[PDB]
Amino acid sequence: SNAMADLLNVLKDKLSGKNVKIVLPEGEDERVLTAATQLQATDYVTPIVLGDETKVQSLAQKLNLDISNIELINPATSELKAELVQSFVERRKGKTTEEQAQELLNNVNYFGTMLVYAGKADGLVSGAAHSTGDTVRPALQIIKTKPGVSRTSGIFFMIKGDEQYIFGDCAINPELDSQGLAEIAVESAKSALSFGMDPKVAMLSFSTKGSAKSDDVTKVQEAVKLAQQKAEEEKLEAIIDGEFQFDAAIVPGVAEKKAPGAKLQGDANVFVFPSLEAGNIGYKIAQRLGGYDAVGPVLQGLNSPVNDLSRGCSIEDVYNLSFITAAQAL
Amino acid sequence: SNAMADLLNVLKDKLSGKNVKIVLPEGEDERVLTAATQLQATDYVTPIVLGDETKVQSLAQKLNLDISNIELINPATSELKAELVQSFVERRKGKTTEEQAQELLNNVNYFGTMLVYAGKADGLVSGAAHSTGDTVRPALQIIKTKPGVSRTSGIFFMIKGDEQYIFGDCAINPELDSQGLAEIAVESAKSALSFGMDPKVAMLSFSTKGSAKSDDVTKVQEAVKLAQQKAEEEKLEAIIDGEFQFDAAIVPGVAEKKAPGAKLQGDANVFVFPSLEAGNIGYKIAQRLGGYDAVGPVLQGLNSPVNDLSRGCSIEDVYNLSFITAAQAL
Ligand SMILES: [Cl-]
Ligand SMILES: [Cl-]
Ligand SMILES: [Cl-]
Ligand SMILES: [Cl-]
Ligand SMILES: [Cl-]
Ligand SMILES: [Cl-]
């Protein structure tokens, strides 16, 4: 099996001919620039690279890359800047002056975020470069969360051989109550659909179907009710159930004994952790002790997708995250 | 490798000739009775089986077991009952009458617990039989936690091939603050020593050494300080450190990057989870996705050890848990 290639093949079938454009603000980053050349040579994702044109071209030359067919935009000299300034001023509802917007939009991450907001591109991948802060920051200001969603959350694809799961929230929210967990469950189901999965979402705990009693157990039980309510409202093509211990969620024989007649019978493929402590630890255990590759974090909940690279990313990481982001944009 | 046999070999070297006696209250349980015969045929653990003598002998016959060399005690007719009644009345400080004690001590779990308290046996393993409640309940009343320990906690040996880790608290305490986590860390270190390990205890979080800020991160940071204080006080032969994400605790290269100069460098063998949600989920992930066997739960913190079997245990589980309990008694 080749789990990463198999995930990409599902995303490619969705993306083929859709012409999705992903902004890569960090054109002076070697990994990003090289990944842009690779994406350009597919049909699925069109990279829009930002930076100083002379510096980016010099870096390409150093790297022995032909970037002549890549769209490369320097914010300060772009014919689009004027419209993006005006839109950013309108979006900010008077919180930013025209002069401030003219200044801010010279920043590659702000400019890139505005390309997405203005419909000139579909999503954005950044974070490889030290000068990029949190990729998500301008996105929160400009793009915002989707109607009905309070906050972003972070998911990972956990992949090994022929197995592919989604785990979340593993990165973002350190304090979660029932409403927050239910939000994560619904967003994760939607993300799983974007990625071509048939979502079966287990809300995890140390209890299975009332086997323990505590405030944290009640929290997850109430989250299941709210998530099911939100899903059914929207006729989401997903099953959401809980509370389950991890084995009851993923082992049919355990489910049969501990959760008889539940909607899930040990066949979950999306796992919602009851806290960030649990999720961060749990994906790291699956990664190291299970030998699963952890692809992410992938952000969900925004009106348009943006995702954040590690400073230590590889070229392949940029390529893969660009595909994931492009799939999210559909 | 044979991870379970290898753990038993360490425990056998400690137990050889020490004549440790483990009470098995459930002599009318097939698994327990068969395990008693197996333990009797070693030198390490002496089983003290309780029950109605005629019923236990009839069950042995049905099972084709020779139990003639096993110590078998019927509480109601035991020559020891009178002394155990008097001791139980004294231990209860007037909360139980002599008549009530005479009645209660006919119960195999109470009688067995009193054998331990009175120094007639060293530990106790129960829980296979439906009529046994929580094995620990009489223990809490009679044996109690060790001086300086508030509560029991539950650990698992996570074993695969040549790898052996301790995870806790994975079973008992649904609400833990810094003091409670520090208690678990110190008890787990002590348990690891009992089991022949050189304990390197990582206190887990979603943060590594200040990489995130939240109340839950502060909780674990403060727990590390308190645990180190308690360990150093007692010149415990253990290292306790944190806070660590799971990969920083167990992967040297991650530790070097994320926790430079920390006391642990990716070489933890004892893992203290920041909550029961995290621990219960985390061991189940290690078990199912990692293919680790999870041996437990093993209780720690009592003045004398008692441990609890699943109703669905095997014969081997009773045998193994008897060895673990006997090791704890040293
Ligand atoms: Cl559902
Ligand atoms: Cl669990
Ligand atoms: Cl990355
Ligand atoms: Cl230490
Ligand atoms: Cl972690
Ligand atoms: Cl068991």
Curated annotation (Swiss-Prot), chains A, B:
Pathway: Metabolic intermediate biosynthesis; acetyl-CoA biosynthesis; acetyl-CoA from acetate: step 2/2. GO terms for molecular function: phosphate acetyltransferase activity. The keyword Transferase applies. Its EC number is 2.3.1.8. InterPro entries: P_Ac_Bu_trans, P_AcTrfase, P_AcTrfase_dom1, P_AcTrfase_dom2, Phos_Acetyltrans/Butyryltrans, PTA_PTB. It is found in: Cytoplasm. Its main location: cytoplasm. GO terms for biological process: acetyl-CoA biosynthetic process. The keyword Cytoplasm applies. GO terms for cellular component: cytoplasm. Keywords: Acyltransferase, Cytoplasm, Transferase. It catalyses: acetyl-CoA + phosphate = acetyl phosphate + CoA. Disulfide bonds: none annotated. It comes from the Bacteria. Gene3D superfamilies: 3.40.50.10950, Isocitrate/Isopropylmalate dehydrogenase-like (3.40.50.10750). Belongs to the phosphate acetyltransferase and butyryltransferase family. This is Phosphate acetyltransferase. The gene is pta.
